[PDB]
Amino acid sequence: MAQASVVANQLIPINTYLTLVMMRSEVVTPVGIPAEDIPRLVSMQVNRAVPLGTTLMPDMVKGYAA
């Protein structure tokens, strides 16, 4: 397991536009959005509440496509 994913560094309320302070990189299982993509997630909106420590998955971000 060496791929790092984007993990919520704080609670992200439903419909928040993502900022850099909200996303950390962590090696977690299952794998979500690759950590390498944090730059392009800024200003994209989540479509559900993301609790602290939750892995961000592609389906939780509106407009995300990798």
Describe the structure.
It is classed as antifreeze. The chain has one domain: Antifreeze-like/N-acetylneuraminic acid synthase C-terminal domain (Type Iii Antifreeze Protein Isoform Hplc 12), CATH 3.90.1210. The protein is mainly beta. It contains one helix and four strands; from the N terminus they run ββαββ. Helix content is 6%, strand content 18%.
Could you name the key traits of this structure?
monomer, 66 residues, mainly beta, Type Iii Antifreeze Protein Isoform Hplc 12, two-stranded antiparallel sheet, 4 strands, 6% helix, antifreeze, antifreeze polypeptide, glycoprotein, monomeric
What order do the helices and strands come in, and which of them pair?
Layout: E1 5-8, E2 23-26, H1 38-41, E3 45-46, E4 61-62
Antiparallel strand pairs: 1-2, 3-4
GO cellular component, one term: extracellular region
Protein name: Type-3 ice-structuring protein HPLC 12
Site (Important for ice-binding): 10, 15, 19, 45
Distance between the termini: 20 Å
**Helix percent band:** under 10%
User: What order do the strands of the largest sheet run in, or round the barrel if closed?
Assistant: 1-2
How many separate domains?
Answer: 1
The H-level CATH homologous superfamily, spelled out, is Antifreeze-like/N-acetylneuraminic acid synthase C-terminal domain
* Overall CATH class: Alpha Beta
Order of helices and strands: EEHEE
Indicate the radius of gyration in whole angstroms.
10 Å
Strand content: 15-25%
Query: What is the multimeric organization of the chains shown?
Result: monomer
How many separate helices?
1
- What best-fitting shape do the alpha-carbon axes yield? globular
- CATH architectural arrangement: Alpha-Beta Complex
Q: How would you sum up the major sheet? A: 2 strands, antiparallel
Structural class: mainly beta
Q: What is the fold named in CATH at topology level?
A: Type Iii Antifreeze Protein Isoform Hplc 12
Number of strands: 4
